[PDB]
PDB file of N, CA and C in Angstrom:
ATOM      1  N   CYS A   1       0.831  -1.195   0.000  1.00 43.38           N
ATOM      2  CA  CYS A   1       0.000   0.000   0.000  1.00 43.38           C
ATOM      3  C   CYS A   1       0.872   1.253   0.000  1.00 43.38           C
ATOM      4  N   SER A   2       0.232   2.417   0.098  1.00 47.19           N
ATOM      5  CA  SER A   2       0.929   3.698   0.038  1.00 47.19           C
ATOM      6  C   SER A   2       0.235   4.675   0.969  1.00 47.19           C
ATOM      7  N   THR A   3       0.970   5.198   1.944  1.00 47.75           N
ATOM      8  CA  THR A   3       0.408   6.177   2.857  1.00 47.75           C
ATOM      9  C   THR A   3       0.306   7.531   2.167  1.00 47.75           C
ATOM     10  N   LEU A   4      -0.263   8.503   2.876  1.00 47.18           N
ATOM     11  CA  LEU A   4      -0.361   9.880   2.397  1.00 47.18           C
ATOM     12  C   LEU A   4       0.235  10.783   3.470  1.00 47.18           C
ATOM     13  N   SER A   5       1.470  11.223   3.257  1.00 46.36           N
ATOM     14  CA  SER A   5       2.158  12.083   4.214  1.00 46.36           C
ATOM     15  C   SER A   5       1.557  13.477   4.134  1.00 46.36           C
ATOM     16  N   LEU A   6       0.686  13.804   5.083  1.00 46.07           N
ATOM     17  CA  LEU A   6       0.056  15.113   5.087  1.00 46.07           C
ATOM     18  C   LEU A   6       1.064  16.187   5.471  1.00 46.07           C
ATOM     19  N   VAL A   7       0.739  17.424   5.113  1.00 44.03           N
ATOM     20  CA  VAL A   7       1.587  18.573   5.391  1.00 44.03           C
ATOM     21  C   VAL A   7       0.751  19.631   6.091  1.00 44.03           C
ATOM     22  N   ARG A   8       1.326  20.249   7.116  1.00 43.85           N
ATOM     23  CA  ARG A   8       0.695  21.357   7.816  1.00 43.85           C
ATOM     24  C   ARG A   8       1.226  22.672   7.265  1.00 43.85           C
ATOM     25  N   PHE A   9       0.327  23.639   7.088  1.00 41.57           N
ATOM     26  CA  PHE A   9       0.740  24.904   6.498  1.00 41.57           C
ATOM     27  C   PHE A   9       1.582  25.714   7.468  1.00 41.57           C
ATOM     28  N   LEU A  10       1.118  25.851   8.710  1.00 40.06           N
ATOM     29  CA  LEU A  10       1.831  26.682   9.670  1.00 40.06           C
ATOM     30  C   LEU A  10       3.250  26.192   9.895  1.00 40.06           C
ATOM     31  N   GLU A  11       3.463  24.880   9.873  1.00 41.47           N
ATOM     32  CA  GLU A  11       4.801  24.350  10.099  1.00 41.47           C
ATOM     33  C   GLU A  11       5.736  24.569   8.919  1.00 41.47           C
ATOM     34  N   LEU A  12       5.255  25.134   7.816  1.00 38.90           N
ATOM     35  CA  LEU A  12       6.117  25.434   6.682  1.00 38.90           C
ATOM     36  C   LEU A  12       6.985  26.639   7.027  1.00 38.90           C
ATOM     37  N   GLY A  13       7.723  27.131   6.040  1.00 35.61           N
ATOM     38  CA  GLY A  13       8.496  28.339   6.230  1.00 35.61           C
ATOM     39  C   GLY A  13       7.778  29.554   5.687  1.00 35.61           C
ATOM     40  N   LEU A  14       7.039  29.366   4.592  1.00 36.50           N
ATOM     41  CA  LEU A  14       6.326  30.468   3.960  1.00 36.50           C
ATOM     42  C   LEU A  14       5.363  31.162   4.914  1.00 36.50           C
ATOM     43  N   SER A  15       4.904  30.464   5.956  1.00 34.11           N
ATOM     44  CA  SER A  15       3.909  31.023   6.866  1.00 34.11           C
ATOM     45  C   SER A  15       4.303  32.398   7.378  1.00 34.11           C
ATOM     46  N   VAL A  16       5.604  32.667   7.482  1.00 33.78           N
ATOM     47  CA  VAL A  16       6.057  33.955   7.981  1.00 33.78           C
ATOM     48  C   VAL A  16       5.631  35.096   7.074  1.00 33.78           C
ATOM     49  N   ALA A  17       5.326  34.825   5.807  1.00 34.85           N
ATOM     50  CA  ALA A  17       5.029  35.912   4.882  1.00 34.85           C
ATOM     51  C   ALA A  17       3.718  36.601   5.234  1.00 34.85           C
ATOM     52  N   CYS A  18       2.647  35.830   5.370  1.00 34.20           N
ATOM     53  CA  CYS A  18       1.314  36.370   5.580  1.00 34.20           C
ATOM     54  C   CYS A  18       0.796  35.984   6.954  1.00 34.20           C
ATOM     55  N   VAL A  19      -0.124  36.791   7.467  1.00 33.41           N
ATOM     56  CA  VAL A  19      -0.806  36.503   8.721  1.00 33.41           C
ATOM     57  C   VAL A  19      -2.173  35.924   8.396  1.00 33.41           C
ATOM     58  N   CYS A  20      -2.489  34.789   9.006  1.00 36.14           N
ATOM     59  CA  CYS A  20      -3.710  34.050   8.721  1.00 36.14           C
ATOM     60  C   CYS A  20      -4.589  34.086   9.962  1.00 36.14           C
ATOM     61  N   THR A  21      -5.786  34.655   9.838  1.00 39.72           N
ATOM     62  CA  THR A  21      -6.707  34.744  10.962  1.00 39.72           C
ATOM     63  C   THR A  21      -8.088  34.260  10.549  1.00 39.72           C
ATOM     64  N   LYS A  22      -8.701  33.438  11.399  1.00 39.39           N
ATOM     65  CA  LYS A  22      -9.951  32.763  11.065  1.00 39.39           C
ATOM     66  C   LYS A  22     -11.115  33.719  11.266  1.00 39.39           C
ATOM     67  N   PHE A  23     -11.626  34.270  10.171  1.00 38.62           N
ATOM     68  CA  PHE A  23     -12.808  35.122  10.216  1.00 38.62           C
ATOM     69  C   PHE A  23     -13.996  34.319   9.715  1.00 38.62           C
ATOM     70  N   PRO A  24     -14.947  33.963  10.578  1.00 43.33           N
ATOM     71  CA  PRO A  24     -15.943  32.962  10.167  1.00 43.33           C
ATOM     72  C   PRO A  24     -17.010  33.501   9.232  1.00 43.33           C
ATOM     73  N   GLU A  25     -17.477  34.726   9.439  1.00 42.78           N
ATOM     74  CA  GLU A  25     -18.628  35.235   8.708  1.00 42.78           C
ATOM     75  C   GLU A  25     -18.255  35.976   7.434  1.00 42.78           C
ATOM     76  N   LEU A  26     -17.029  35.808   6.940  1.00 43.67           N
ATOM     77  CA  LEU A  26     -16.611  36.546   5.755  1.00 43.67           C
ATOM     78  C   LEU A  26     -17.543  36.280   4.584  1.00 43.67           C
ATOM     79  N   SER A  27     -17.924  35.017   4.382  1.00 41.66           N
ATOM     80  CA  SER A  27     -18.744  34.667   3.228  1.00 41.66           C
ATOM     81  C   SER A  27     -20.051  35.443   3.211  1.00 41.66           C
ATOM     82  N   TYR A  28     -20.526  35.872   4.376  1.00 42.63           N
ATOM     83  CA  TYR A  28     -21.746  36.661   4.447  1.00 42.63           C
ATOM     84  C   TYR A  28     -21.467  38.150   4.283  1.00 42.63           C
ATOM     85  N   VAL A  29     -20.511  38.678   5.052  1.00 44.94           N
ATOM     86  CA  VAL A  29     -20.242  40.116   5.050  1.00 44.94           C
ATOM     87  C   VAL A  29     -19.402  40.568   3.871  1.00 44.94           C
ATOM     88  N   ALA A  30     -18.976  39.656   3.003  1.00 44.75           N
ATOM     89  CA  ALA A  30     -18.192  40.072   1.850  1.00 44.75           C
ATOM     90  C   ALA A  30     -19.034  40.731   0.771  1.00 44.75           C
ATOM     91  N   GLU A  31     -20.346  40.864   0.978  1.00 45.65           N
ATOM     92  CA  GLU A  31     -21.217  41.401  -0.059  1.00 45.65           C
ATOM     93  C   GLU A  31     -20.874  42.837  -0.421  1.00 45.65           C
ATOM     94  N   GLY A  32     -20.235  43.574   0.479  1.00 45.47           N
ATOM     95  CA  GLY A  32     -19.818  44.927   0.178  1.00 45.47           C
ATOM     96  C   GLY A  32     -18.316  45.093   0.223  1.00 45.47           C
ATOM     97  N   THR A  33     -17.858  46.293   0.555  1.00 43.48           N
ATOM     98  CA  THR A  33     -16.445  46.586   0.714  1.00 43.48           C
ATOM     99  C   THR A  33     -16.131  46.822   2.185  1.00 43.48           C
ATOM    100  N   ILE A  34     -14.846  46.787   2.510  1.00 45.08           N
ATOM    101  CA  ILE A  34     -14.364  47.051   3.858  1.00 45.08           C
ATOM    102  C   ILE A  34     -13.563  48.347   3.912  1.00 45.08           C
ATOM    103  N   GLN A  35     -12.642  48.534   2.968  1.00 46.52           N
ATOM    104  CA  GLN A  35     -12.141  49.857   2.598  1.00 46.52           C
ATOM    105  C   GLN A  35     -11.491  50.575   3.785  1.00 46.52           C
ATOM    106  N   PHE A  36     -10.357  50.033   4.214  1.00 47.17           N
ATOM    107  CA  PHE A  36      -9.508  50.697   5.192  1.00 47.17           C
ATOM    108  C   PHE A  36      -8.226  51.172   4.526  1.00 47.17           C
ATOM    109  N   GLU A  37      -7.894  52.441   4.737  1.00 46.46           N
ATOM    110  CA  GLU A  37      -6.616  52.993   4.325  1.00 46.46           C
ATOM    111  C   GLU A  37      -5.564  52.697   5.391  1.00 46.46           C
ATOM    112  N   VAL A  38      -4.303  53.015   5.088  1.00 51.01           N
ATOM    113  CA  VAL A  38      -3.251  52.686   6.042  1.00 51.01           C
ATOM    114  C   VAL A  38      -2.584  53.931   6.614  1.00 51.01           C
ATOM    115  N   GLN A  39      -1.846  54.668   5.779  1.00 50.55           N
ATOM    116  CA  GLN A  39      -0.998  55.746   6.284  1.00 50.55           C
ATOM    117  C   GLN A  39      -0.231  56.447   5.174  1.00 50.55           C
ATOM    118  N   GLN A  40       0.496  57.505   5.531  1.00 48.39           N
ATOM    119  CA  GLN A  40       1.646  57.999   4.783  1.00 48.39           C
ATOM    120  C   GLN A  40       2.400  59.002   5.645  1.00 48.39           C
ATOM    121  N   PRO A  41       3.711  58.867   5.793  1.00 48.51           N
ATOM    122  CA  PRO A  41       4.482  59.871   6.531  1.00 48.51           C
ATOM    123  C   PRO A  41       4.656  61.130   5.696  1.00 48.51           C
ATOM    124  N   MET A  42       5.061  62.205   6.367  1.00 50.07           N
ATOM    125  CA  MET A  42       5.258  63.478   5.688  1.00 50.07           C
ATOM    126  C   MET A  42       6.308  64.301   6.417  1.00 50.07           C
ATOM    127  N   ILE A  43       7.263  64.826   5.660  1.00 50.12           N
ATOM    128  CA  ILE A  43       8.345  65.629   6.213  1.00 50.12           C
ATOM    129  C   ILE A  43       7.845  67.043   6.448  1.00 50.12           C
ATOM    130  N   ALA A  44       8.248  67.630   7.568  1.00 51.03           N
ATOM    131  CA  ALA A  44       7.870  69.001   7.892  1.00 51.03           C
ATOM    132  C   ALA A  44       8.846  69.931   7.188  1.00 51.03           C
ATOM    133  N   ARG A  45       8.489  70.351   5.983  1.00 51.42           N
ATOM    134  CA  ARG A  45       9.322  71.282   5.241  1.00 51.42           C
ATOM    135  C   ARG A  45       9.158  72.691   5.792  1.00 51.42           C
ATOM    136  N   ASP A  46      10.233  73.474   5.719  1.00 49.21           N
ATOM    137  CA  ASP A  46      10.136  74.871   6.106  1.00 49.21           C
ATOM    138  C   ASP A  46       9.308  75.639   5.079  1.00 49.21           C
ATOM    139  N   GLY A  47       8.997  76.886   5.406  1.00 46.49           N
ATOM    140  CA  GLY A  47       8.115  77.665   4.573  1.00 46.49           C
ATOM    141  C   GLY A  47       6.670  77.267   4.795  1.00 46.49           C
ATOM    142  N   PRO A  48       5.771  78.249   4.810  1.00 43.67           N
ATOM    143  CA  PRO A  48       4.391  77.979   5.233  1.00 43.67           C
ATOM    144  C   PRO A  48       3.626  77.212   4.165  1.00 43.67           C
ATOM    145  N   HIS A  49       3.031  76.098   4.567  1.00 44.70           N
ATOM    146  CA  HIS A  49       2.194  75.338   3.653  1.00 44.70           C
ATOM    147  C   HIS A  49       0.938  76.141   3.336  1.00 44.70           C
TER     148      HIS A  49
ATOM    149  N   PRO B   1    -108.334  13.279   2.624  1.00 45.61           N
ATOM    150  CA  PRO B   1    -107.288  12.499   3.295  1.00 45.61           C
ATOM    151  C   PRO B   1    -106.071  13.347   3.628  1.00 45.61           C
ATOM    152  N   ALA B   2    -105.388  12.959   4.700  1.00 45.51           N
ATOM    153  CA  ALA B   2    -104.297  13.757   5.228  1.00 45.51           C
ATOM    154  C   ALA B   2    -103.089  13.700   4.297  1.00 45.51           C
ATOM    155  N   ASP B   3    -102.018  14.350   4.727  1.00 46.24           N
ATOM    156  CA  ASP B   3    -100.759  14.359   4.010  1.00 46.24           C
ATOM    157  C   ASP B   3     -99.667  13.787   4.903  1.00 46.24           C
ATOM    158  N   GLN B   4     -98.653  13.281   4.289  1.00 43.96           N
ATOM    159  CA  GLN B   4     -97.547  12.740   5.056  1.00 43.96           C
ATOM    160  C   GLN B   4     -96.365  13.702   5.038  1.00 43.96           C
ATOM    161  N   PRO B   5     -95.552  13.707   6.084  1.00 42.69           N
ATOM    162  CA  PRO B   5     -94.361  14.566   6.076  1.00 42.69           C
ATOM    163  C   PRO B   5     -93.311  14.045   5.116  1.00 42.69           C
ATOM    164  N   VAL B   6     -93.149  14.711   3.976  1.00 40.84           N
ATOM    165  CA  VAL B   6     -92.173  14.264   2.992  1.00 40.84           C
ATOM    166  C   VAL B   6     -90.798  14.780   3.379  1.00 40.84           C
ATOM    167  N   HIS B   7     -89.766  14.202   2.775  1.00 42.16           N
ATOM    168  CA  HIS B   7     -88.407  14.694   2.913  1.00 42.16           C
ATOM    169  C   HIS B   7     -87.609  14.194   1.721  1.00 42.16           C
ATOM    170  N   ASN B   8     -86.457  14.814   1.506  1.00 41.76           N
ATOM    171  CA  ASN B   8     -85.597  14.485   0.382  1.00 41.76           C
ATOM    172  C   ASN B   8     -84.221  14.070   0.888  1.00 41.76           C
ATOM    173  N   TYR B   9     -83.388  13.622  -0.045  1.00 42.45           N
ATOM    174  CA  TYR B   9     -82.043  13.168   0.282  1.00 42.45           C
ATOM    175  C   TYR B   9     -81.079  13.699  -0.762  1.00 42.45           C
ATOM    176  N   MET B  10     -79.998  14.319  -0.302  1.00 42.06           N
ATOM    177  CA  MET B  10     -79.038  14.959  -1.188  1.00 42.06           C
ATOM    178  C   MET B  10     -77.654  14.364  -0.984  1.00 42.06           C
ATOM    179  N   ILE B  11     -76.976  14.113  -2.099  1.00 39.45           N
ATOM    180  CA  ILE B  11     -75.628  13.568  -2.126  1.00 39.45           C
ATOM    181  C   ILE B  11     -74.730  14.611  -2.773  1.00 39.45           C
ATOM    182  N   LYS B  12     -73.645  14.973  -2.093  1.00 38.13           N
ATOM    183  CA  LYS B  12     -72.730  15.984  -2.598  1.00 38.13           C
ATOM    184  C   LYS B  12     -71.303  15.448  -2.620  1.00 38.13           C
ATOM    185  N   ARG B  13     -70.498  16.006  -3.523  1.00 39.74           N
ATOM    186  CA  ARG B  13     -69.135  15.556  -3.769  1.00 39.74           C
ATOM    187  C   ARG B  13     -68.137  16.597  -3.279  1.00 39.74           C
ATOM    188  N   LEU B  14     -66.972  16.128  -2.842  1.00 37.84           N
ATOM    189  CA  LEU B  14     -65.912  16.996  -2.340  1.00 37.84           C
ATOM    190  C   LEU B  14     -64.889  17.227  -3.448  1.00 37.84           C
ATOM    191  N   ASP B  15     -64.837  18.452  -3.962  1.00 41.72           N
ATOM    192  CA  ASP B  15     -63.913  18.810  -5.032  1.00 41.72           C
ATOM    193  C   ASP B  15     -62.599  19.284  -4.421  1.00 41.72           C
ATOM    194  N   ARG B  16     -61.495  18.689  -4.862  1.00 43.51           N
ATOM    195  CA  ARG B  16     -60.197  18.883  -4.235  1.00 43.51           C
ATOM    196  C   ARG B  16     -59.341  19.875  -5.010  1.00 43.51           C
ATOM    197  N   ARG B  17     -58.711  20.789  -4.277  1.00 44.20           N
ATOM    198  CA  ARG B  17     -57.683  21.668  -4.806  1.00 44.20           C
ATOM    199  C   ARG B  17     -56.550  21.718  -3.794  1.00 44.20           C
ATOM    200  N   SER B  18     -55.515  22.489  -4.113  1.00 48.85           N
ATOM    201  CA  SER B  18     -54.384  22.645  -3.211  1.00 48.85           C
ATOM    202  C   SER B  18     -53.626  23.903  -3.594  1.00 48.85           C
ATOM    203  N   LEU B  19     -53.148  24.625  -2.590  1.00 47.83           N
ATOM    204  CA  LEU B  19     -52.336  25.809  -2.808  1.00 47.83           C
ATOM    205  C   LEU B  19     -50.907  25.539  -2.365  1.00 47.83           C
ATOM    206  N   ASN B  20     -49.985  26.333  -2.898  1.00 46.86           N
ATOM    207  CA  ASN B  20     -48.589  26.206  -2.517  1.00 46.86           C
ATOM    208  C   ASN B  20     -47.917  27.566  -2.590  1.00 46.86           C
ATOM    209  N   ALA B  21     -46.887  27.735  -1.766  1.00 45.85           N
ATOM    210  CA  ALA B  21     -46.043  28.917  -1.785  1.00 45.85           C
ATOM    211  C   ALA B  21     -44.633  28.494  -1.419  1.00 45.85           C
ATOM    212  N   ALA B  22     -43.670  29.372  -1.681  1.00 43.05           N
ATOM    213  CA  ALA B  22     -42.284  29.003  -1.458  1.00 43.05           C
ATOM    214  C   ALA B  22     -41.449  30.244  -1.203  1.00 43.05           C
ATOM    215  N   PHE B  23     -40.290  30.018  -0.594  1.00 44.96           N
ATOM    216  CA  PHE B  23     -39.272  31.034  -0.395  1.00 44.96           C
ATOM    217  C   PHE B  23     -37.922  30.364  -0.602  1.00 44.96           C
ATOM    218  N   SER B  24     -36.857  31.027  -0.169  1.00 44.48           N
ATOM    219  CA  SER B  24     -35.526  30.450  -0.261  1.00 44.48           C
ATOM    220  C   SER B  24     -34.685  30.948   0.901  1.00 44.48           C
ATOM    221  N   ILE B  25     -33.375  30.731   0.788  1.00 49.24           N
ATOM    222  CA  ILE B  25     -32.423  31.189   1.787  1.00 49.24           C
ATOM    223  C   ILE B  25     -31.040  31.105   1.161  1.00 49.24           C
ATOM    224  N   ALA B  26     -30.183  32.068   1.494  1.00 47.97           N
ATOM    225  CA  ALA B  26     -28.910  32.239   0.807  1.00 47.97           C
ATOM    226  C   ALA B  26     -27.821  31.389   1.446  1.00 47.97           C
ATOM    227  N   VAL B  27     -27.016  30.743   0.597  1.00 50.45           N
ATOM    228  CA  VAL B  27     -25.997  29.816   1.083  1.00 50.45           C
ATOM    229  C   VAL B  27     -25.043  30.505   2.045  1.00 50.45           C
ATOM    230  N   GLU B  28     -24.839  31.809   1.881  1.00 49.67           N
ATOM    231  CA  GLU B  28     -23.921  32.518   2.763  1.00 49.67           C
ATOM    232  C   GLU B  28     -24.486  32.623   4.172  1.00 49.67           C
ATOM    233  N   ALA B  29     -25.808  32.717   4.300  1.00 49.58           N
ATOM    234  CA  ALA B  29     -26.456  32.851   5.595  1.00 49.58           C
ATOM    235  C   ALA B  29     -26.990  31.529   6.132  1.00 49.58           C
ATOM    236  N   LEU B  30     -26.553  30.398   5.579  1.00 47.86           N
ATOM    237  CA  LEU B  30     -27.004  29.104   6.089  1.00 47.86           C
ATOM    238  C   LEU B  30     -26.280  28.748   7.383  1.00 47.86           C
ATOM    239  N   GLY B  31     -24.966  28.559   7.301  1.00 48.11           N
ATOM    240  CA  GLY B  31     -24.192  28.169   8.463  1.00 48.11           C
ATOM    241  C   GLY B  31     -24.082  29.236   9.524  1.00 48.11           C
ATOM    242  N   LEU B  32     -24.467  30.468   9.206  1.00 51.34           N
ATOM    243  CA  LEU B  32     -24.468  31.524  10.202  1.00 51.34           C
ATOM    244  C   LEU B  32     -25.521  31.281  11.276  1.00 51.34           C
ATOM    245  N   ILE B  33     -26.555  30.499  10.974  1.00 54.42           N
ATOM    246  CA  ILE B  33     -27.673  30.327  11.892  1.00 54.42           C
ATOM    247  C   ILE B  33     -27.492  29.063  12.720  1.00 54.42           C
ATOM    248  N   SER B  34     -27.457  27.910  12.054  1.00 54.88           N
ATOM    249  CA  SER B  34     -27.400  26.647  12.777  1.00 54.88           C
ATOM    250  C   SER B  34     -25.978  26.258  13.159  1.00 54.88           C
ATOM    251  N   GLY B  35     -24.975  26.859  12.526  1.00 55.33           N
ATOM    252  CA  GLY B  35     -23.595  26.497  12.786  1.00 55.33           C
ATOM    253  C   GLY B  35     -23.167  26.730  14.218  1.00 55.33           C
ATOM    254  N   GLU B  36     -22.873  25.648  14.936  1.00 57.27           N
ATOM    255  CA  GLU B  36     -22.457  25.728  16.328  1.00 57.27           C
ATOM    256  C   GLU B  36     -20.947  25.863  16.479  1.00 57.27           C
ATOM    257  N   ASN B  37     -20.253  26.306  15.430  1.00 58.39           N
ATOM    258  CA  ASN B  37     -18.817  26.540  15.527  1.00 58.39           C
ATOM    259  C   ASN B  37     -18.504  27.876  16.188  1.00 58.39           C
ATOM    260  N   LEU B  38     -19.399  28.850  16.054  1.00 59.80           N
ATOM    261  CA  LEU B  38     -19.186  30.188  16.596  1.00 59.80           C
ATOM    262  C   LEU B  38     -19.192  30.124  18.118  1.00 59.80           C
ATOM    263  N   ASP B  39     -18.031  30.345  18.733  1.00 56.39           N
ATOM    264  CA  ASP B  39     -17.881  30.041  20.156  1.00 56.39           C
ATOM    265  C   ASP B  39     -18.352  31.178  21.060  1.00 56.39           C
ATOM    266  N   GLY B  40     -17.674  32.322  21.015  1.00 58.13           N
ATOM    267  CA  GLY B  40     -17.827  33.276  22.097  1.00 58.13           C
ATOM    268  C   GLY B  40     -18.483  34.612  21.814  1.00 58.13           C
ATOM    269  N   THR B  41     -18.271  35.174  20.632  1.00 60.09           N
ATOM    270  CA  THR B  41     -18.747  36.520  20.350  1.00 60.09           C
ATOM    271  C   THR B  41     -19.663  36.605  19.141  1.00 60.09           C
ATOM    272  N   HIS B  42     -19.460  35.766  18.130  1.00 59.21           N
ATOM    273  CA  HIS B  42     -20.338  35.766  16.971  1.00 59.21           C
ATOM    274  C   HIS B  42     -21.737  35.246  17.283  1.00 59.21           C
ATOM    275  N   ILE B  43     -21.937  34.584  18.425  1.00 57.88           N
ATOM    276  CA  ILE B  43     -23.270  34.114  18.777  1.00 57.88           C
ATOM    277  C   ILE B  43     -24.206  35.259  19.120  1.00 57.88           C
ATOM    278  N   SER B  44     -23.667  36.431  19.447  1.00 59.89           N
ATOM    279  CA  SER B  44     -24.465  37.613  19.742  1.00 59.89           C
ATOM    280  C   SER B  44     -24.071  38.790  18.855  1.00 59.89           C
ATOM    281  N   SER B  45     -23.571  38.506  17.657  1.00 59.77           N
ATOM    282  CA  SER B  45     -23.165  39.560  16.747  1.00 59.77           C
ATOM    283  C   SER B  45     -24.391  40.296  16.220  1.00 59.77           C
ATOM    284  N   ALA B  46     -24.154  41.259  15.335  1.00 62.56           N
ATOM    285  CA  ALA B  46     -25.255  41.981  14.710  1.00 62.56           C
ATOM    286  C   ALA B  46     -25.746  41.295  13.441  1.00 62.56           C
ATOM    287  N   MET B  47     -24.837  40.723  12.651  1.00 62.17           N
ATOM    288  CA  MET B  47     -25.255  40.051  11.427  1.00 62.17           C
ATOM    289  C   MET B  47     -26.052  38.785  11.718  1.00 62.17           C
ATOM    290  N   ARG B  48     -25.781  38.110  12.838  1.00 60.33           N
ATOM    291  CA  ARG B  48     -26.597  36.951  13.176  1.00 60.33           C
ATOM    292  C   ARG B  48     -28.030  37.365  13.467  1.00 60.33           C
ATOM    293  N   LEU B  49     -28.202  38.392  14.300  1.00 61.20           N
ATOM    294  CA  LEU B  49     -29.517  38.983  14.506  1.00 61.20           C
ATOM    295  C   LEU B  49     -30.169  39.332  13.176  1.00 61.20           C
TER     296      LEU B  49
END
């Protein structure tokens, strides 16, 4: 016979790239947008803006 | 000569019909209701209501 050596995702190395969080109701609330912005830094230049 | 109290006899038939109506439910909102996986906070969420 032949076994099936299963693999776990978290135990891989790639897992460090993305963060995985279990959101259960996504399939329902995905009907619209979520639309969060992030940021941008800005240097304080001299002279009046 | 007198008269006798007459009477009649009537036979009636039962005519059969039937009505029907229907609705549906969305696959996204199926497991949100009966699904007992939601442990601590989604059981009293707003989308479940």
